[PDB]
Design a protein around this ligand. Structure first.
Ligand code: F43
Ligand SMILES: C[C@@H](OP(=O)(O)O)[C@H](NC(=O)CCCCCCS)C(=O)O
Ligand SMILES: O=S(=O)(O)CCS
Lengths: 429, 118, 247, 560, 483
């Protein structure tokens, strides 16, 4: 199983790269992306100063009256960065990097990888960053002994009274491990707006990075053992990483006047030509049931077609709303028109059903940008349906209410400064 | 219209002193009801490996007050009274000086019920 | 040779607490080992000590440096079961208090597991080690039979006003004044002995207050003991800063 | 079956062709395809008139808008007639309103009984006492200790009359031990079950002794379901200390405190993930096997179809009306997604027809036994499910009233899929066979009618077929183990009720004593509970008539 | 004439004329306690401004006061469990869910002015003009809904019930009142707004180890419990406010959440100690115990040492001169609890700082231990020994302003007789300053409603009423139950 990986402009990145070489547990760039997501955290200096001044800290609506501290954190953000780097870093000169992002309002704290190798999970980054910021505040701004709690909770929110830092001003790409729906789901717990914002709204970059996270979290959860390793790697290569440029070829050929039906025709034509499926039986009415000679390859083709169709539908409409219907109906009409199961064997189709329901009804969910791989609505597809959601959100034009800015302004501003995230396909290739 | 009082001996009364004390308080005018609270006096061990054994406490005696025999379950260490007039409160405090041989407290307020139950 | 001071305080209660903690108590009475075993009520007096496991001599032990360096107590070398002697001390000037009775136990006897409540002080140890500790506590001024006593169950009565004749209240009557002396006639679990144990006379109120460790407004009050208050303030202050910043 | 088909027809007659209240539906042809809509408004129900009057009166009394049917958009509720519901397998006629769990006392009492119940293992506590405390436990000592537990558990500061529904019982796999113990505290497996059922129960629990603990219902209502374990542990510790003459305070007794409190404590449910965070003893963690076992229909009946259907009815109610209808969702409710599977006998008619079909094709494979059962293959599942689904579709298309009754497609899809899965699990004795038949029924329904169900009813049914036989980590478990916390099943209605009945059928058709847990079958095998788990569907009907008296009511401590 | 024999010394509710037997204050036998917990449990706050932005953007609607009147009437119809869109369905009986309603309080003065005054919580009317000004400054010109779902639904369910039910009925009411489609993306955005983006829960969700969920007593921090109690809105005595918060918090935490406390709200011992403390602080620190933001003293170790030591010494003397509440068969842990509560409330009132109150609490505990040699049962001492060093630490798992502390705080996680004192201390930190709210103005205004069956102005008086069989709680099913 050898594919080519094509970047979002349709150019050739690397030729003949073996599929197994591209696995989460083997690829160096994917491992680096995982490590950076684990260690990097973002601090809102503006929010810290606002909470200190107004006492608005500890969650939604909370405000302590009469204990306001008036510190110019934003003005002295450079010295704060230097001291936070001094505190966080384990040894001098290691991988610890702290940058001041966007004119002092926010910080980027990337704790050293030693703090990751010397702990069970990624929360060391968040806790050490919050501790460093709190210590630097108390140090350089001369906070009284009895004002320490206020400076602490202007960074830590309500922790430990709450499980997470509710109302805090330090946060990372991944939520706390206590929020997982299962074993290994932590890497899947990244909302769609985060991936849309990180790649600066680039559809085949948001899709690539979201699929990288999804497949990392599915390898972690024992989803790729034996033949399933190949099963998932084929899907990742074909859908997420633009294997052999199929997705972008389909996008170009069905862009100007395409629909879901034309993309279905494109996928079935490419499958029949490449030999992935061939006519097994012909019914008396002339309908030709097809049989999948290469079952994981057919699943990969269905996933690539799903992503391409989401591109076409949500780019013709310029609304991230249509992603749920695209994911449902591409697979559904593919089953109807070929006689074969859709991508991930009805799993992607069912995830699209639930995700279209919950984004179109009174029962919760929300816009397509609040769904992640850990969501109970969308935790079912084995890495083939959330990439489409993230790509759709990146491909919206001001239609959503809970936009990328509203939910992930800090995340976008801070993590859009890493090249391994703005260009995930180039990194992986 | 009534006022109600407690007497708090500095030492938990023995049955004999409590025997005389409560006896003549019933002779005191202006008492609606009286209460005696204190530590309980079990007749059997009810805890520990020595459970279910006979205990015959020195303080558990049939006090003879007002021609009535009463089997103390307790060592009376708190007596709450009930008087419809304050001028008898002077009487009650006065009598506790003579025949309680040690220091005691004397407050006033709502003590027993002053409230319906059940 | 660091000469321990055991406590701050120049008042009488300071000296008494230093005595309780330091174990330099006055043997104010005497009680026989058979009588002590009977009152403990853990077994039949004059028997060998039951064991919960074989002796460490034959049981074999791992190559633990601590075991080789910490000589096991005689009550554990014979694998004696673990048993408890419990006391209830009155707040009305009784010669000891739960925390300081526990300090005595933990400073003066190896292999002890003192446990302090507001109305109890349980000493739990291998049966003959607890025998030793109970004998020391009963024979010395630390235990006033009128203002103290073994109590294994229903320990209510430490904060109750003393009996009208000056004995701490007891629901089960493990001891009472008999002919001017304290006679203990039940185990600490309040099922009777076959005998009567004489604990001497109850120390009078004045000398009881002289050899107390409770702080009271009647006797030496906590308010005027500027030394103890200063100690408490210093400890609390150090706790507060060093919680803020350990420096 | 013809008899069940007859009762289905009679239910349609009493529902549409007969008038209820003042909807003026008297007359008609239950095989007819036309009707005239009178548009009488919500005042045709009479009970709805009661609700309107009460809401208006409360609106004047309190001082804010409370309940005005005119704020229904368009026209008020009931532009087509308000026809009643009939509980499957019984003749009590119920109004739709009375089957909302808020309005049904028995419906509430079911969950208040599963929630407040716990079972604590007892061998380890006796073993610790014997070995490491010397106090040998003799059946007289157990009698005394259980007497102490039985009223201490109610609280003894709990009100003597406010906690009358708070008791503890024991059941043991040791036949000779349960003989001496005072029978007021013993659940006797040998005389509450048949010989073979009791044999399997004893074989599965071994020589072990267990306690069935039921804390007061008012305590369960006030707090959550995670208070049950702690209340039981505290009362167990108190009873051990106060019944075996043991001092509280020594270190060695703490080992017994652990052993008797929570070392062999089996919870009804377990923890849930973050979005639906909840603790033990909530419906999201209650397995399908555990619900199959809480229903004592297996213990008291030999008919496998009836057992599976009764489990389906109770299940839909617990998992749809309470769990998904209230906890995860709230609102008006989901009573009519649930009444489909335990009202009007469409599900019973389909399932009895499937029983007849299987017994005719597979030599009575759907009869009780374990050797006649056909091995589960794709051919058998395809055959049974498709025929079942085709018959159910033909019945909806042949009786327009049955189609109007399950007006929303979700009810029809649930009924068809439940019948197909129950039939497949009966024929094959494999719960996952019933699951795959369920999903094939959903596919046949979709392709036949061009519509399946609500927007997201097909989530676990598109994910359904492929995950039935997978052995991947988060996909696949035997059904008996599955539950509302299963990843596919966590958030959708109209399924989880039928899933439990599927697992019950796989073991009901074999004459099995229990589905997944014997401790639950025996724990709830006690006719002292205020709820009757032997037949739950008859219980919901009893509540809907205002003839069910629950526990946890505070009338004694409240002004009258 | 009669002679009574009893050994349980019936409790008299602090600052009241009601004496109740000790087994009438158990939450099983006290309906007022259960109703208090129900009101806290079933209550939620959802904002109207984010949904309004969604309607005005996605649909292009105009959100005027008349449309809000129509929508609020719709919602008050639909919240108790009634249908507003489609047909042939059940609806919860209006008799069993009559304790459910939705009101809006807004920091916009006008928008509150032209909205129907039956669905509006008027900040200016309910609060003093200073407190009202503080609240309006805190919340801004934003509208909020105060949703209270039925008592029966919350009893048959957990505390996670509330946000779900409220969001479903809010979405349905939007759909009915604003003539938008039953299913479309705008409906999802409203649901996501109500469920998460603009929801204020009474409590947060607890970690896995504590086998319980959101909006339970363990998630209800001390600031929220201070804001729920409405004495700071009704009275100006800075000590009475703290004492009321202590009395309600002791019940809600110790009796319900942890399953004694009674003394804190009975016999007027802690009240007497606190009033003496206030007098002492006024005498020595130039009347810093009075209301005001300037008359408070900077919180330092010397000030807290003086106040806490004096309070503890006074409490010890009062116990040793007239115990009258000892001799209870169960020890004297309540003595330590009362002394620490008095010391902490005094320190908070004098300094206006909650952690100073905590330091006073722990210092009083230590003075107790050293003066008497008792501290309590086996438990109890854990929290104090720890927490004395956790008051001012700014480490991650230790250290939080008290206002943001709660029963899920690590030290406070398991032991009784402490958390009510902390809630009272957090309340007193701000009550002496005359502040409108402790940590959350939305909770402070949400519970300034008189339709509650429970009076949150006098919580202890409510317990007293409940103990004498004169409290009528909601959630009774007598309509459906047979007679
Ligand atoms: C607004 C929605 C979208 C949404 O997220 N939920 C709604 C409405 C909601 C409300 C209706 C109460 C009200 O009026 O306030 C409730 C009761 C949920 C709640 N808040 O308790 C509900 N649906 Ni719906 N909903 C149902 C169903 C349905 C079926 C109804 C089809 C038909 O022909 O009537 C369709 C979807 C589908 O096509 O399957 C449906 C849609 C819809 N459902 C459309 C309203 C459709 C309309 O305008 O007519 N429900 C059903 O399939 C039957 C049972 C009924 C549920 C009530 C009950 O069973 O207790 C109710 C379940
Ligand atoms: C999805 C999720 O919603 P949120 O992610 O919270 O918006 C979840 N809903 C429930 O799982 C579904 C309840 C409604 C079911 C309607 C019939 S499918 C919940 O309440 O947490
Ligand atoms: O209209 S929807 O199918 O989304 C919900 C019906 S319960």
């Amino acid at each position: 199983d050898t594919v080519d990986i094509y970047d979002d402009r349709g150019k050739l990145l690397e030729s003949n790269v073996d599929i197994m070489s591209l696995a989460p547990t083997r690829n160096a760039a994917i491992k680096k992306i995982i490590l950076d997501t684990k260690r990097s955290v973002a601090v809102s200096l503006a929010g810290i100063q606002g909470a200190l001044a107004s006492g608005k800290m500890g969650g939604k609506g909370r405000q302590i009256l009469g204990r306001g501290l008036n510190y110019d954190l934003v003005g002295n953000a450079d010295a704060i960065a230097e001291n936070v780097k001094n505190l966080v870093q384990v040894d001098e000169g290691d991988d610890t990097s702290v940058k001041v992002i966007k004119g002092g309002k926010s910080l980027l704290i990337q704790a050293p990888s030693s703090r990751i190798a010397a702990g069970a999970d990624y929360m060391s980054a968040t806790t050490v960053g919050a501790a460093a910021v709190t210590q630097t505040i108390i140090d350089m701004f001369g906070t009284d002994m009895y004002d320490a709690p206020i400076a602490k909770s202007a960074v830590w929110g309500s922790y430990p009274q709450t499980m997470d830092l509710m109302g805090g001003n330090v946060q990372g790409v991944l939520s706390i491990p206590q929020n997982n729906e299962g074993l290994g789901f932590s890497l899947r717990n990244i909302m769609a707006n985060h991936i849309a914002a990180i790649t600066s709204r680039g559809a085949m970059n948001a899709a690539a990075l979201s699929s990288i996270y999804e497949q990392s979290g599915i390898f972690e959860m024992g989803g790729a053992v034996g033949m399933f390793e190949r099963h998932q790697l084929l899907g990742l290569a074909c859908q997420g990483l633009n294997a052999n440029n199929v997705v972008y070829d389909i996008v170009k050929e069905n862009g100007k006047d395409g629909t879901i039906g034309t993309v279905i025709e494109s996928i079935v034509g490419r499958a029949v030509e490449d030999g992935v499926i061939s006519v097994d039986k012909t019914a008396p009415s002339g309908y030709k049931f097809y049989k999948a000679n290469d079952v994981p390859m057919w699943n990969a083709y269905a996933a690539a077609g799903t992503l391409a169709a989401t591109f076409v539908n949500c780019g013709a409409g310029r609304a991230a709303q249509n992603v749920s219907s695209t994911l449902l109906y591409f697979n559904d009409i593919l089953e109807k028109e070929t006689g074969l199961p859709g991508c991930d064997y009805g799993k992607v189709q069912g995830v699209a059903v639930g995700f279209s329901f919950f984004s179109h009804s009174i029962y919760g969910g929300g816009g397509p940008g609040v769904f992640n791989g850990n969501h109970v609505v969308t935790r079912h597809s084995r890495g083939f349906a959330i990439p489409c959601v993230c790509a759709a959100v990146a491909l919206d034009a001001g239609t959503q209410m809970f936009t990328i800015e509203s939910t992930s302004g800090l995340i976008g501003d801070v993590f859009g400064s890493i090249e391994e995230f703005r260009q995930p396909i180039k990194a992986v290739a | 219209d009534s006022i109600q009082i407690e007497i708090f001996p500095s030492r938990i009364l023995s049955p004999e002193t409590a025997q005389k004390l409560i006896s003549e308080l019933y002779q005191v005018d202006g008492i609606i009801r009286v209460m005696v609270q204190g530590p309980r006096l079990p007749e059997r061990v009810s805890a520990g490996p020595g459970t279910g054994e006979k205990v015959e406490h020195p303080l558990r005696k049939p006090i003879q007050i007002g021609d009535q025999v009463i089997e103390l379950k307790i060592s009376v260490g708190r007596i709450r009274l009930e008087i419809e007039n304050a001028e008898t409160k002077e009487k009650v405090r006065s009598v506790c000086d003579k025949m309680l041989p040690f220091s005691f407290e004397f407050r006033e307020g709502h003590f027993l019920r002053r409230k319906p139950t059940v | 040779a660091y000469e321990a001071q055991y406590y701050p305080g120049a008042t009488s209660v300071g000296a008494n607490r230093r005595k309780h903690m330091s174990g330099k108590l006055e043997k104010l009475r005497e009680i026989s080992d058979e009588d002590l075993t009977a009152v403990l009520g853990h077994r039949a007096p004059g028997s060998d000590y039951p064991s919960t496991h074989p002796p460490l001599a034959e049981m074999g032990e791992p190559a633990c440096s601590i075991r080789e360096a910490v000589a096991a107590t005689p009550g554990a070398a014979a694998g004696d079961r673990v048993r408890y002697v419990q006391f209830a001390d009155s707040m009305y000037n009784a010669p000891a208090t739960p925390y300081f009775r526990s300090y005595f136990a933990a400073i003066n006897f190896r292999g002890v597991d003192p446990g302090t409540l507001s109305g109890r002080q349980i000493v739990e140890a291998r049966e003959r080690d607890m025998e030793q500790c109970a004998k020391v506590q009963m024979e010395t001024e630390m235990t006033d039979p009128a203002l103290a006593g073994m109590r294994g169950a229903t320990v209510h009565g430490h904060s109750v006003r003393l009996q009208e004749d000056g004995v701490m209240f007891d629901m089960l009557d493990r001891r009472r004044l008999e002919g001017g002396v304290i006679i203990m006639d039940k185990d600490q679990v309040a099922i009777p002995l076959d005998r009567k144990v004489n604990l001497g006379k109850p120390m009078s109120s004045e000398e009881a207050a002289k050899r107390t460790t409770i702080y009271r407004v009647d006797n030496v009050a906590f308010r005027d003991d500027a030394e103890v208050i200063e100690w408490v303030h210093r400890v609390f202050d150090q706790r507060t800063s060093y919680g803020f910043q350990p420096k | 079956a013809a008899d069940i088909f007859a009762k289905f027809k009679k239910s349609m007659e009493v529902k549409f062709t007969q008038e209820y209240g003042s909807n003026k539906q008297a007359g008609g042809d239950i095989t007819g395809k036309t009707e005239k809509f009178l548009r009488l408004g919500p005042e045709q129900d009479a009970r709805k008139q009661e609700m309107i009057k009460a809401g208006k009166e409360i609106a004047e009394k309190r001082g804010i808008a409370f309940y005005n049917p005119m704020m229904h958009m368009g026209a008020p509720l009931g532009q087509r007639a308000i026809t009643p519901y009939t509980i499957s397998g019984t003749d009590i006629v119920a109004e739709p309103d009375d089957l909302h769990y808020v309005n049904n006392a028995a419906m509430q009492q079911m969950w208040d009984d599963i929630r407040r119940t716990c079972i604590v293992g007892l061998d380890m506590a006796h073993e610790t006492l014997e070995k490491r405390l010397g106090k040998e436990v003799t059946p007289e000592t157990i009698n005394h200790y259980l007497e102490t537990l039985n009223h201490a558990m109610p609280g003894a500061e709990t009100h003597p009359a406010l906690v009358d529904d708070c008791y503890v019982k024991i059941f043991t796999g040791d036949d000779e031990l349960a003989d001496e113990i005072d029978k007021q505290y013993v659940i006797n497996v040998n005389k509450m079950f048949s010989e073979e059922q009791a044999a399997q129960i004893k074989a599965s629990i071994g020589k072990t002794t267990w306690q069935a603990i039921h804390i007061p219902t008012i305590v369960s209502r006030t707090t959550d379901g995670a208070q049950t374990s702690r209340w039981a542990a505290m009362q167990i510790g108190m009873s051990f200390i106060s019944a075996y003459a043991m001092c509280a305070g020594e270190a060695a007794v703490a080992d017994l405190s652990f052993a008797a409190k929570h070392a062999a404590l089996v919870s009804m449910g377990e923890m849930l993930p973050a979005r639906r965070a909840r603790g033990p003893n909530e419906p999201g963690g209650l397995s399908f096997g555990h619900l199959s076992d809480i229903v004592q229909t297996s213990r008291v009946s030999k008919d496998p179809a009836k057992i599976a259907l009764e489990v389906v009815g109770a299940g839909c109610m617990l998992y749809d009306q309470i769990w998904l209808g209230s906890y995860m969702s709230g609102g008006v409710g989901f009573t009519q997604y649930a009444t489909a599977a335990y009202t009007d006998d469409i599900l019973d008619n389909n399932t009895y027809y499937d029983v007849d079909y299987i017994n005719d094709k597979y030599n009575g494979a759907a009869n009780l036994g374990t050797d006649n059962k056909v091995k589960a293959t794709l051919d058998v599942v395809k055959d049974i499910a498709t025929e079942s689904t085709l018959y159910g579709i033909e019945t909806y298309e042949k009786f327009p009233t049955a189609l109007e009754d399950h007006f929303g497609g979700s009810q029809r899809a649930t009924v068809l899929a439940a019948a197909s899965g129950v039939a497949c699990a009966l024929a094959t004795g494999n719960a996952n066979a019933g699951l795959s038949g369920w999903y094939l029924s959903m596919y046949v329904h979709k392709e036949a009618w061009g519509r399946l169900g609500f927007f997201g009813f097909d989530l676990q049914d598109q994910c359904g077929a492929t995950n039935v036989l997978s052995y991947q980590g988060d996909e696949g478990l035997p059904d008996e183990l599955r539950g509302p916390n299963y990843p596919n099943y966590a958030m959708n209605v109209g399924h989880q009720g039928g899933y439990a009945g599927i697992a019950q059928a796989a073991h009901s058709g074999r004459g099995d004593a229990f589905t997944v847990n014997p401790l639950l079958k025996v724990c709830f095998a006690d006719e002292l509970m205020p709820f009757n788990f032997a037949e739950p569907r008859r219980e919901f009907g009893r509540g809907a008539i205002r003839e069910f008296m629950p526990a946890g009511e505070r009338s004694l401590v409240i002004p009258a």
